[PDB]
Swiss-Prot record, chain B:
Family of the protein in this entry: Belongs to the bacterial flagellin family.
Organism: Rhizobium meliloti (Ensifer meliloti)
Protein localization: Secreted; Bacterial flagellum
The encoding gene: flaA
Described function: Flagellin is the subunit protein which polymerizes to form the filaments of bacterial flagella. Homomer of FlaA is able to form a functional filament.
Annotated protein name in UniProt: Flagellin A
Residues of the full protein shown: 100 to 149 of 395
Domain of life: Bacteria
Length: 99, 50
């Protein structure tokens, strides 16, 4: 009977592990999108370091890319717990996945 | 799990607690249910003619 109860507990742990894996996958996809966008931003800026290039066009490009970054950060949420855009007023927040 | 909402599980456990109460009070044969005894004295004892 104790072993059956333990088996039920491990089944619940498996369900929690699946949920956490889905959350991590969503967070990683959003993270990769943000990395690609910021790489594009860096490429645009290092192109713009030349003085012969008008900087207003680059400025509006980075503005659009920053808006895209904000949208990606606030949208990459699976079940509310998005593991991104947290509250750092306390100093440190730790998310846990049932192992 | 932190991501799982706790309210739905809350009424789940509420229903299970009501089920436990029903199990405790219904399981009787002839008034001597051997459960839900009065522990005012803390030493209630039931016997069967052997």
């Amino acid at each position: 009977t104790t072993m059956r109860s333990d088996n039920q507990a491990l089944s619940a742990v498996q369900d929690a592990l699946g949920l956490g894996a889905a959350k991590v996958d969503t967070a990683y996809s959003g993270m990769e999108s943000a990395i690609e966008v910021v790489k594009e931003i860096k490429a645009k800026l290092v192109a713009a370091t030349e003085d012969g290039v008008d900087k207003a066009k680059i400025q509006e490009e980075i503005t659009q890319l920053k808006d895209q970054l904000t949208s990606i950060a606030d949208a990459a949420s699976f079940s509310g717990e998005n593991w991104l855009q947290a509250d750092l007023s306390g100093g440190a927040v730790t998310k846990s996945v049932v192992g």
